[PDB]
Amino acid sequence: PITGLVYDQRMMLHHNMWDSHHPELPQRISRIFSRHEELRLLSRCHRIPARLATEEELALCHSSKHISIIKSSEHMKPRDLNRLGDEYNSIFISNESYTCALLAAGSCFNSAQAILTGQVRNAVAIVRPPGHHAEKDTACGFCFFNTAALTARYAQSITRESLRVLIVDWDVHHGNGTQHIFEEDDSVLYISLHRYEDGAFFPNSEDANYDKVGLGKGRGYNVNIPWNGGKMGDPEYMAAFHHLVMPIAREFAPELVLVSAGFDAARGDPLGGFQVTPEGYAHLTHQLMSLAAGRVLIILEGGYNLTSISESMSMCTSMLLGDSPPSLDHLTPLKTSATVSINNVLRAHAPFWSSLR
Ligand SMILES: CCCc1nc2ccccn2c1Nc1ccc(C(=O)NO)cc1
Ligand SMILES: [K+]
Ligand SMILES: [K+]
Ligand SMILES: [Zn+2]
């Protein structure tokens, strides 16, 4: 019945020394946090302590080599930090980056613990750097370790291996790392909504397409919902949740819901180019809350407008706290390309999910 909230100031020590205005600013987690205090949402939450993820915990998803490299970044000269940053796609490294990644992963571990024990009902994690682009062996797109995947694996490790975990990635970018991490796995259902534009959008790969339904034992447990044809807003995400996310999720019957809650699909984002309003995010959160008896963890990922992300994640926290959902627009209809996308996903996943047939 109570909502946990984890946040640590120390996660701002990760920064870009060569570009001070690089959009993945440290203030992102602070600004959001301040909103939670000034809308008096923080007063109504149970503060969960941050902590450092152990290297054995990072081993749940990442190889020892990758861990050892990013760990070696801790004590490096700035020239070496640039040298190692250039070895990855869209990655800047600081001396403090490894610690901040450990803080994000550990914070989400403590949140998942407080949920799975019974301390809290649901929880929200205001963390950085993000994680869903990180893969088992490499760092990508502002991410070092996959916080969501590691939180699923840890949640299984403190309960049972077969624990059904639902990861819903509504960041505007595809979570390639989470997909590849759980591609052959049926215990973790991964569903992503992402701007695709037929590979023209980052991470610029055809792996984000609707036909990637998983591999072998994990076939059908990987739902890609790719958007094409310009800006999308509340109508399209609401329709994708109505016809795909919630039916498949209800058939899957998850026991823990992790939300890769990137807010770069929001209004006013310079990188996503979408117009999902904070009230729409509130409605998606409210819909996800009806699953897994309410056990939902909202992990911050992307989102590069301070006001947009503060308002949006504050709305999600309001829904987690039990407030009633604000009324939403009139939708009108959907961009035809979005209906075509939903129909493509439905055709791809109908053989695996009876509730789609
Ligand atoms: C904006 C700074 C760097 C940049 N500029 C472009 C232009 C086109 C395509 C990619 N670009 C990237 N790289 C990104 C990697 C990850 C993310 C992400 O994960 N957001 O949540 C966003 C951008
Ligand atoms: K996504
Ligand atoms: K999967
Ligand atoms: Zn993103």
Short mmCIF file of C-alpha atoms and ligand atoms in Angstrom, two decimals:
data_model
loop_
_atom_site.label_atom_id
_atom_site.label_comp_id
_atom_site.label_asym_id
_atom_site.label_seq_id
_atom_site.Cartn_x
_atom_site.Cartn_y
_atom_site.Cartn_z
CA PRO A 1 0.00 0.00 0.00
CA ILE A 2 3.05 2.27 0.24
CA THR A 3 5.28 3.54 -2.58
CA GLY A 4 9.04 3.36 -2.26
CA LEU A 5 11.27 6.06 -3.73
CA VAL A 6 15.03 5.71 -4.16
CA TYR A 7 17.31 8.61 -5.06
CA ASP A 8 20.94 9.45 -4.30
CA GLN A 9 22.64 12.80 -4.90
CA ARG A 10 25.92 10.92 -5.43
CA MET A 11 24.65 9.74 -8.83
CA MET A 12 25.31 13.22 -10.24
CA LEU A 13 29.10 12.78 -10.10
CA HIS A 14 29.00 11.10 -13.54
CA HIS A 15 29.56 13.82 -16.13
CA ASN A 16 30.93 14.68 -19.57
CA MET A 17 34.14 16.69 -19.17
CA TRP A 18 34.56 17.39 -22.90
CA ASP A 19 30.96 18.60 -23.43
CA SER A 20 29.32 20.42 -20.52
CA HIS A 21 25.96 20.66 -22.33
CA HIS A 22 25.69 17.03 -23.46
CA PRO A 23 21.98 16.30 -22.88
CA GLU A 24 22.56 13.46 -20.37
CA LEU A 25 23.02 16.06 -17.63
CA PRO A 26 23.47 15.18 -13.94
CA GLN A 27 20.65 17.58 -13.02
CA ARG A 28 18.14 15.20 -14.64
CA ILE A 29 17.81 13.08 -11.51
CA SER A 30 18.01 16.10 -9.18
CA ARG A 31 15.40 18.20 -11.00
CA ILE A 32 12.92 15.30 -11.03
CA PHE A 33 13.66 14.73 -7.34
CA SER A 34 13.01 18.39 -6.54
CA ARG A 35 9.62 18.16 -8.27
CA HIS A 36 8.73 15.16 -6.10
CA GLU A 37 9.47 17.32 -3.06
CA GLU A 38 7.57 20.41 -4.23
CA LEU A 39 4.46 18.55 -5.40
CA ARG A 40 4.72 16.94 -1.93
CA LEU A 41 4.90 13.45 -3.44
CA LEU A 42 8.12 12.66 -1.55
CA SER A 43 6.32 13.18 1.77
CA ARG A 44 3.94 10.35 0.85
CA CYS A 45 6.68 7.85 -0.08
CA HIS A 46 8.96 5.48 1.81
CA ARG A 47 12.58 6.42 1.12
CA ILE A 48 14.59 3.39 -0.04
CA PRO A 49 18.37 3.64 0.49
CA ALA A 50 20.73 3.51 -2.45
CA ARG A 51 23.64 1.09 -2.41
CA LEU A 52 26.46 -0.23 -4.58
CA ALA A 53 25.88 -3.27 -6.75
CA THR A 54 28.48 -5.96 -6.20
CA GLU A 55 30.54 -7.33 -9.07
CA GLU A 56 29.01 -10.77 -8.54
CA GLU A 57 25.68 -8.98 -9.05
CA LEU A 58 26.93 -7.35 -12.25
CA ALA A 59 27.92 -10.88 -13.32
CA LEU A 60 24.20 -11.75 -13.56
CA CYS A 61 24.14 -10.15 -17.03
CA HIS A 62 27.65 -8.92 -17.91
CA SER A 63 30.91 -10.68 -18.72
CA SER A 64 33.92 -10.27 -16.45
CA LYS A 65 35.84 -8.44 -19.20
CA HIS A 66 33.31 -5.61 -19.60
CA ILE A 67 33.02 -5.23 -15.81
CA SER A 68 36.81 -5.15 -15.48
CA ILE A 69 37.18 -2.45 -18.14
CA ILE A 70 34.52 -0.11 -16.77
CA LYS A 71 35.92 -0.76 -13.28
CA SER A 72 39.38 0.19 -14.55
CA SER A 73 37.89 3.51 -15.69
CA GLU A 74 37.79 4.45 -11.99
CA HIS A 75 41.49 5.45 -11.93
CA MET A 76 42.34 6.90 -15.34
CA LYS A 77 43.85 10.07 -16.76
CA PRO A 78 41.46 12.23 -18.83
CA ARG A 79 43.24 11.24 -22.06
CA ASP A 80 42.63 7.58 -21.23
CA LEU A 81 39.01 8.36 -20.35
CA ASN A 82 38.50 9.90 -23.79
CA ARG A 83 40.35 6.96 -25.38
CA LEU A 84 38.06 4.42 -23.69
CA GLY A 85 34.94 6.50 -24.33
CA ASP A 86 35.65 6.51 -28.06
CA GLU A 87 35.72 2.68 -28.09
CA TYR A 88 31.94 2.66 -27.52
CA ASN A 89 28.98 4.02 -29.46
CA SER A 90 27.65 7.18 -27.75
CA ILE A 91 29.54 6.91 -24.47
CA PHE A 92 31.38 9.46 -22.36
CA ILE A 93 33.26 8.31 -19.27
CA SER A 94 34.27 10.05 -16.05
CA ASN A 95 36.30 8.88 -13.09
CA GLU A 96 33.01 8.64 -11.16
CA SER A 97 31.00 6.82 -13.84
CA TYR A 98 31.60 3.28 -12.55
CA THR A 99 30.45 4.23 -9.04
CA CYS A 100 27.30 5.94 -10.36
CA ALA A 101 26.41 2.88 -12.45
CA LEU A 102 26.86 0.72 -9.34
CA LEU A 103 24.59 3.14 -7.46
CA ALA A 104 21.82 2.87 -10.06
CA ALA A 105 21.96 -0.93 -10.15
CA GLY A 106 22.09 -1.23 -6.36
CA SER A 107 19.26 1.26 -5.87
CA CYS A 108 17.05 -0.79 -8.17
CA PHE A 109 18.09 -3.97 -6.36
CA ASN A 110 17.00 -2.46 -3.04
CA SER A 111 13.74 -1.33 -4.64
CA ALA A 112 13.00 -4.79 -6.06
CA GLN A 113 13.82 -6.22 -2.62
CA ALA A 114 11.45 -3.85 -0.81
CA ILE A 115 8.73 -4.84 -3.29
CA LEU A 116 9.27 -8.60 -3.27
CA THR A 117 9.47 -8.84 0.53
CA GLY A 118 6.35 -6.79 1.23
CA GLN A 119 7.91 -3.61 2.59
CA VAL A 120 6.45 -1.54 -0.27
CA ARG A 121 3.77 -2.21 -2.88
CA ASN A 122 5.35 -0.34 -5.82
CA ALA A 123 8.43 1.84 -6.18
CA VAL A 124 10.14 4.43 -8.37
CA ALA A 125 13.89 4.75 -9.08
CA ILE A 126 15.35 8.15 -9.99
CA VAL A 127 18.74 6.92 -11.20
CA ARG A 128 21.44 7.65 -13.77
CA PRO A 129 23.21 6.68 -15.99
CA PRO A 130 20.52 4.74 -17.92
CA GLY A 131 20.91 1.06 -18.73
CA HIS A 132 18.79 -0.50 -21.46
CA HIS A 133 21.38 0.04 -24.23
CA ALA A 134 24.08 -1.76 -22.24
CA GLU A 135 24.77 -5.32 -23.40
CA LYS A 136 26.47 -8.31 -21.80
CA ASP A 137 29.85 -7.39 -23.29
CA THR A 138 29.71 -3.69 -24.16
CA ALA A 139 28.50 -0.21 -23.21
CA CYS A 140 26.21 1.72 -25.54
CA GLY A 141 24.13 4.90 -25.76
CA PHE A 142 24.91 6.57 -22.39
CA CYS A 143 24.61 3.20 -20.58
CA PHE A 144 27.29 1.12 -18.84
CA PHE A 145 25.34 -1.70 -17.16
CA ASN A 146 21.77 -2.83 -17.86
CA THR A 147 19.93 -1.75 -14.71
CA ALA A 148 16.58 -3.27 -15.71
CA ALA A 149 17.97 -6.64 -16.81
CA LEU A 150 20.14 -6.83 -13.70
CA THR A 151 17.11 -6.02 -11.55
CA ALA A 152 15.14 -8.85 -13.16
CA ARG A 153 17.98 -11.34 -12.68
CA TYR A 154 18.47 -10.19 -9.08
CA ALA A 155 14.72 -10.41 -8.40
CA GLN A 156 14.90 -14.02 -9.60
CA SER A 157 18.03 -14.65 -7.53
CA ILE A 158 16.37 -13.56 -4.26
CA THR A 159 13.18 -15.48 -5.08
CA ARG A 160 13.19 -18.30 -7.64
CA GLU A 161 14.79 -18.66 -11.06
CA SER A 162 11.45 -19.07 -12.87
CA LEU A 163 9.92 -15.85 -11.46
CA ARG A 164 7.92 -14.23 -14.26
CA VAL A 165 9.28 -10.70 -14.76
CA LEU A 166 7.68 -8.27 -17.22
CA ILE A 167 9.92 -5.50 -18.57
CA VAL A 168 8.00 -2.70 -20.30
CA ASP A 169 10.37 -0.32 -22.10
CA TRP A 170 8.54 2.86 -23.11
CA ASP A 171 11.70 4.88 -23.72
CA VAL A 172 11.53 6.22 -27.27
CA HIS A 173 14.68 4.23 -28.16
CA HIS A 174 14.84 0.46 -28.50
CA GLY A 175 16.42 -1.37 -25.59
CA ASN A 176 18.80 -3.54 -27.60
CA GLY A 177 20.68 -4.65 -24.49
CA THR A 178 17.61 -5.95 -22.68
CA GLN A 179 16.31 -7.68 -25.81
CA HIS A 180 19.60 -9.46 -26.45
CA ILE A 181 19.99 -10.29 -22.75
CA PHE A 182 16.57 -11.99 -22.54
CA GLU A 183 16.25 -13.01 -26.20
CA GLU A 184 16.31 -16.77 -25.48
CA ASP A 185 14.52 -16.50 -22.11
CA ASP A 186 10.87 -17.25 -21.36
CA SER A 187 10.91 -16.23 -17.67
CA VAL A 188 11.30 -12.51 -18.55
CA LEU A 189 8.80 -11.07 -21.03
CA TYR A 190 10.31 -8.02 -22.75
CA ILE A 191 7.98 -5.53 -24.45
CA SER A 192 9.31 -2.34 -26.04
CA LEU A 193 7.73 0.71 -27.67
CA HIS A 194 10.23 2.62 -29.76
CA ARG A 195 10.62 5.07 -32.62
CA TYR A 196 11.98 2.99 -35.50
CA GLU A 197 11.49 4.76 -38.87
CA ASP A 198 12.80 1.59 -40.57
CA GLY A 199 16.22 1.73 -38.93
CA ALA A 200 16.64 5.49 -39.36
CA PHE A 201 16.37 6.07 -35.59
CA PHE A 202 18.97 5.18 -32.97
CA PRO A 203 20.13 2.48 -32.20
CA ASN A 204 19.80 2.29 -36.01
CA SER A 205 19.32 -1.47 -36.27
CA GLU A 206 16.71 -3.80 -37.74
CA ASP A 207 16.70 -5.66 -34.40
CA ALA A 208 14.02 -3.23 -33.18
CA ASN A 209 11.57 -4.50 -35.82
CA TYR A 210 8.34 -6.33 -35.02
CA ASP A 211 9.54 -9.66 -36.44
CA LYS A 212 12.07 -10.16 -33.60
CA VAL A 213 9.86 -12.31 -31.38
CA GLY A 214 12.68 -14.01 -29.47
CA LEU A 215 14.75 -17.12 -30.07
CA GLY A 216 14.05 -20.79 -29.37
CA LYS A 217 12.70 -21.20 -25.85
CA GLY A 218 12.06 -17.46 -25.60
CA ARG A 219 10.06 -17.12 -28.81
CA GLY A 220 7.05 -14.86 -28.42
CA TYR A 221 8.51 -13.43 -25.20
CA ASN A 222 10.02 -10.46 -27.08
CA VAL A 223 7.44 -7.93 -28.30
CA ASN A 224 8.78 -5.05 -30.40
CA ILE A 225 6.34 -2.21 -31.14
CA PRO A 226 8.11 0.04 -33.68
CA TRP A 227 6.80 3.48 -34.67
CA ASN A 228 7.11 4.92 -38.18
CA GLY A 229 5.96 8.16 -39.77
CA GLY A 230 6.71 11.16 -37.58
CA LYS A 231 5.48 12.23 -34.18
CA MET A 232 3.44 9.89 -32.00
CA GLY A 233 1.50 10.89 -28.92
CA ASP A 234 -0.97 9.63 -26.35
CA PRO A 235 -3.44 8.04 -28.85
CA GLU A 236 -0.85 5.69 -30.35
CA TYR A 237 0.70 4.53 -27.06
CA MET A 238 -2.78 4.12 -25.56
CA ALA A 239 -3.82 1.97 -28.52
CA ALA A 240 -0.63 -0.09 -28.34
CA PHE A 241 -1.30 -0.71 -24.64
CA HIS A 242 -4.97 -1.53 -25.29
CA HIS A 243 -4.38 -4.04 -28.09
CA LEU A 244 -0.92 -5.47 -27.32
CA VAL A 245 0.87 -4.62 -24.07
CA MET A 246 -1.97 -5.33 -21.64
CA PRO A 247 -3.45 -8.45 -23.32
CA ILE A 248 -0.04 -10.12 -23.69
CA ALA A 249 0.94 -8.98 -20.19
CA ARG A 250 -2.25 -10.40 -18.69
CA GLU A 251 -1.76 -13.74 -20.45
CA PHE A 252 1.86 -13.80 -19.26
CA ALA A 253 0.64 -13.16 -15.67
CA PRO A 254 3.82 -11.50 -14.36
CA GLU A 255 4.75 -11.37 -10.70
CA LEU A 256 7.09 -8.36 -10.98
CA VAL A 257 6.75 -5.44 -13.40
CA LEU A 258 9.85 -3.39 -14.24
CA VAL A 259 9.34 -0.28 -16.39
CA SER A 260 12.29 1.04 -18.39
CA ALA A 261 10.80 4.50 -17.95
CA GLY A 262 12.64 6.68 -20.39
CA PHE A 263 10.78 9.94 -20.89
CA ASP A 264 12.41 11.04 -24.16
CA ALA A 265 9.16 10.31 -26.01
CA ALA A 266 7.62 13.19 -24.05
CA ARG A 267 6.53 16.62 -25.21
CA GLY A 268 9.49 18.97 -25.53
CA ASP A 269 12.21 16.36 -25.89
CA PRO A 270 14.99 17.43 -28.29
CA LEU A 271 16.02 13.86 -29.14
CA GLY A 272 12.84 11.79 -29.40
CA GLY A 273 10.57 14.08 -31.40
CA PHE A 274 7.36 12.67 -29.90
CA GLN A 275 4.54 14.34 -27.96
CA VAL A 276 3.54 11.92 -25.20
CA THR A 277 2.04 14.08 -22.45
CA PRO A 278 2.57 13.57 -18.70
CA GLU A 279 -1.10 12.59 -18.39
CA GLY A 280 -0.52 9.87 -20.98
CA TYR A 281 2.40 8.55 -18.96
CA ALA A 282 0.05 8.64 -15.97
CA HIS A 283 -2.46 6.50 -17.88
CA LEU A 284 0.18 3.95 -18.92
CA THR A 285 1.37 3.68 -15.32
CA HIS A 286 -2.22 3.27 -14.12
CA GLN A 287 -2.75 0.48 -16.66
CA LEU A 288 0.44 -1.34 -15.65
CA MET A 289 -0.56 -1.10 -11.97
CA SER A 290 -3.36 -3.65 -12.52
CA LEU A 291 -0.72 -6.35 -13.09
CA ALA A 292 1.31 -8.50 -10.69
CA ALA A 293 -0.89 -7.43 -7.76
CA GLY A 294 0.56 -3.92 -8.13
CA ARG A 295 4.26 -4.83 -7.87
CA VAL A 296 5.68 -2.22 -10.26
CA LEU A 297 9.15 -0.63 -10.25
CA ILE A 298 9.55 2.49 -12.40
CA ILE A 299 13.24 2.77 -13.38
CA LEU A 300 14.32 6.05 -14.95
CA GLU A 301 16.17 5.76 -18.27
CA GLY A 302 16.22 8.42 -20.99
CA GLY A 303 14.56 11.81 -21.27
CA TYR A 304 16.45 15.04 -21.89
CA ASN A 305 14.05 17.88 -21.09
CA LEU A 306 14.32 18.63 -17.38
CA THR A 307 10.78 20.00 -17.08
CA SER A 308 9.27 17.25 -19.26
CA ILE A 309 10.90 14.41 -17.32
CA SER A 310 10.20 16.00 -13.92
CA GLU A 311 6.50 16.46 -14.71
CA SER A 312 6.10 13.06 -16.39
CA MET A 313 7.82 10.94 -13.75
CA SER A 314 6.05 12.97 -11.07
CA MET A 315 2.77 11.93 -12.71
CA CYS A 316 3.86 8.28 -12.69
CA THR A 317 4.69 8.58 -8.99
CA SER A 318 1.24 10.10 -8.41
CA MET A 319 -0.40 7.08 -10.03
CA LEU A 320 1.80 4.77 -7.95
CA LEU A 321 0.69 6.64 -4.82
CA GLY A 322 -2.98 5.97 -5.61
CA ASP A 323 -4.20 9.26 -7.10
CA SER A 324 -6.86 9.16 -9.79
CA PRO A 325 -5.74 9.49 -13.42
CA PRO A 326 -6.20 12.89 -15.05
CA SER A 327 -8.59 12.96 -17.99
CA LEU A 328 -6.83 12.78 -21.35
CA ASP A 329 -7.40 14.64 -24.62
CA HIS A 330 -9.74 13.23 -27.27
CA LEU A 331 -7.01 11.27 -29.11
CA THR A 332 -8.95 11.85 -32.38
CA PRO A 333 -7.70 8.85 -34.43
CA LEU A 334 -4.21 7.40 -34.84
CA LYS A 335 -1.60 8.02 -37.49
CA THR A 336 -2.33 5.27 -40.01
CA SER A 337 1.28 4.07 -39.77
CA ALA A 338 0.74 3.39 -36.06
CA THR A 339 -2.29 1.19 -36.77
CA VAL A 340 -0.18 -0.58 -39.40
CA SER A 341 2.56 -1.09 -36.80
CA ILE A 342 0.13 -2.48 -34.22
CA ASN A 343 -1.33 -4.82 -36.84
CA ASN A 344 2.17 -5.99 -37.80
CA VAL A 345 3.02 -6.77 -34.17
CA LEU A 346 -0.32 -8.53 -33.73
CA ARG A 347 0.31 -10.70 -36.79
CA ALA A 348 3.81 -11.49 -35.53
CA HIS A 349 2.76 -12.50 -32.01
CA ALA A 350 -0.70 -14.03 -32.49
CA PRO A 351 0.73 -17.60 -32.80
CA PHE A 352 2.21 -17.29 -29.29
CA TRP A 353 -0.56 -15.43 -27.42
CA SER A 354 -4.12 -16.76 -27.52
CA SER A 355 -5.50 -13.46 -26.17
CA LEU A 356 -4.40 -11.95 -29.50
CA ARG A 357 -6.42 -14.47 -31.55
C1 LIG B 1 22.41 13.75 -28.52
C2 LIG B 1 23.86 13.32 -28.25
C3 LIG B 1 24.47 12.18 -29.12
C4 LIG B 1 23.70 11.61 -30.32
N1 LIG B 1 23.31 12.38 -31.43
C5 LIG B 1 22.66 11.51 -32.28
C6 LIG B 1 22.05 11.76 -33.57
C7 LIG B 1 21.46 10.71 -34.23
C8 LIG B 1 21.44 9.41 -33.67
C9 LIG B 1 22.02 9.16 -32.44
N2 LIG B 1 22.63 10.22 -31.76
C10 LIG B 1 23.30 10.27 -30.50
N3 LIG B 1 23.46 9.15 -29.66
C11 LIG B 1 22.49 8.78 -28.71
C12 LIG B 1 22.63 7.58 -27.99
C13 LIG B 1 21.68 7.20 -27.03
C14 LIG B 1 20.55 7.97 -26.74
C15 LIG B 1 19.55 7.53 -25.72
O1 LIG B 1 19.62 6.38 -25.24
N4 LIG B 1 18.51 8.36 -25.24
O2 LIG B 1 17.66 7.84 -24.29
C16 LIG B 1 20.43 9.16 -27.47
C17 LIG B 1 21.37 9.56 -28.42
K K B 2 11.63 1.27 -25.63
K K B 3 12.33 -12.57 -23.40
ZN ZN B 4 16.06 6.86 -25.02
#
